[PDB]
Design a binder for this molecule. Structure first.
Ligand SMILES: NC(=O)[C@H]1CCC[C@H]1c1ccsc1
Ligand SMILES: NC(=O)[C@H]1CCC[C@H]1c1ccsc1
Lengths: 304, 304
């Protein structure tokens, strides 16, 4: 029992973190097989960052300009290429700690673990969600760029995020491991406002199922609703619209608890309309939206 | 920027987790050097757990009754002893993945990382605090016993917690790695009520400093208070009394922010007396007490 914001064990990703230095800029890279993946802004001075021409900046860079250190042993760079917003540095040695891995572009609402890193060294691990405005609410200081988000399925690490940038509003923007930004963000020091940070309704509902399973039931009411009626309420409160897809995904939590998805929607409707009246749910005084239905099943069943 | 409930990288502890089986009971052990540490209730049937005589149960057990598996390779047990509430199983092989490590008994209010495990396999990692009533608010299913709490100082893992028991109130009790329970808890299936779960005042104040550093300042007021005056308010709200020791520990956050500890105490006093009036601090609608002053400094400075 008990419900915790839980990250994946970070060991498999720890073994892939390296330091990448180009001139005076140091940040983190990800070493998988004989390739080190890092943000392309490694080649920039913070002066460059106001309006960088990455193609032009990269012409000036040779393999020997990319200093790659794994612990206290230097990797030899035999090749470099820009793919979108990442650099791929070919090294002469395959990372012996390379786990089974995939590159995946996640959808907004999807959760993952961040191994925050500085100078290629892990500092800590936390669970995130891709916000519907394609930002993440992270914890990243100068030097954290190239820190990666990931999921683990048994022994396979699915990398989904590489950290690139803090918006002037202190939220975080980054790419997949093909170097494509989530959302409309560019690797430039410029006016970039995030859109509306909507609540991930299916995640809140999953979290309400998790609460019921853990004995926090005070918020269960006598009411039901319809997808259309719920969705009017959700519009009002900047909640993501709930689809039949979301209802189907919540099926196993529905079955386990014996609470129909639409009944739980009516509980959420009352919580939105009435607030928690100074009460808590799984030790939160607001509605948590960074557990997926899959996250609730996994934590509540104990998958390793 | 941004502030996250952050766990230590779990890699170093992942390499120590093994499965221990005695008859029909399986749980987790911790393999350091040539010793596997596990909860002594590994020798119990859930029938035994109502009133176990561990000394008597252990007479019936030989080294070959303790099945210890690290991945898919069996460890040979050459010795067993009971120390307090843990078993120490001497194996013929030193864990090659043994990190630098210490056993430490933490004080209530101290934070640590839990690597939740099932059948010796890591499922996830989260940050905890030892509550002032010597319970932890964990996430532990059947099979999670022997999962361990730890801190890391650069390369040294300080193990502080081994998981033993869920109270009927769904909070968690356990031992240090010498097998001494935190608080008055015993490894028996019996009436055990936790005392008052007081709020860790010095941690809440550290978290308010973290909020100020991250731009969440709405709660800073024009008032100050005294230790004695604050402590009357803290008594009323089941907050731990604030000592000069706590004030000294908060010194560096005080210096960084230029907000005197007693001024911040007056901000906390108003928040206790007035509540947050539907507002949030670092994305929380209540006062977070599971960051230590050390945690705030580390996260806010980026220690690896
Ligand atoms: N907004 C930021 O993170 C800037 C401060 C440090 C990195 C730099 C940047 C800008 C666009 S990509 C990286
Ligand atoms: N309260 C509990 O956790 C019981 C259920 C499973 C383990 C068993 C126990 C009791 C005292 S120590 C371990």
């Amino acid at each position: 029992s008990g419900f915790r914001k839980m990250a994946f064990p970070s060991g498999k990703v720890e073994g892939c973190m390296v330091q990448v230095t180009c001139g005076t800029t140091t940040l983190n890279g990800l070493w998988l097989d004989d390739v080190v993946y890092c943000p392309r802004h490694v080649i920039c001075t913070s002066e460059d960052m106001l309006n960088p021409n990455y193609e032009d900046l990269l012409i000036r860079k040779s393999n020997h300009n990319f200093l790659v250190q794994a612990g206290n042993v230097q990797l030899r760079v035999i090749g470099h290429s820009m793919q979108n917003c990442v650099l791929k540095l070919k090294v002469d040695t395959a990372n012996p700690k390379t786990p089974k891995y995939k590159f995946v572009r996640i959808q907004p609402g999807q959760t993952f673990s961040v191994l925050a890193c500085y100078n290629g060294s892990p500092s800590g691990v936390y669970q995130c969600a891709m916000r519907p405005n394609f930002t993440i609410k992270g914890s990243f200081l100068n030097g954290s760029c190239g820190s990666v988000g990931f999921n683990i399925d048994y022994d396979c690490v699915s990398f989904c995020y590489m950290h690139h940038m803090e918006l002037p509003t202190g939220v975080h923007a980054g790419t997949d491991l093909e170097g494509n930004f989530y959302g409309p963000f560019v690797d430039r020091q410029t006016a970039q406002a995030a859109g509306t940070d909507t609540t991930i309704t299916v995640n809140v509902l999953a979290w309400l199922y998790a609460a019921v399973i853990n004995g926090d039931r005070w918020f269960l009411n006598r009411f039901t609703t319809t997808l259309n009626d719920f969705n009017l309420v959700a519009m009002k409160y900047n909640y993501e619209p709930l689809t039949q897809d979301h209802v189907d995904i919540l099926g196993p939590l529905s079955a386990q608890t014996g609470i129909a998805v639409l009944d739980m929607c009516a509980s959420l409707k009352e919580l939105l309309q009435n607030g928690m009246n100074g009460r808590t749910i799984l030790g939160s005084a607001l509605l948590e939206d960074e557990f997926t239905p899959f996250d609730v099943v996994r934590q509540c069943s104990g998958v390793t």
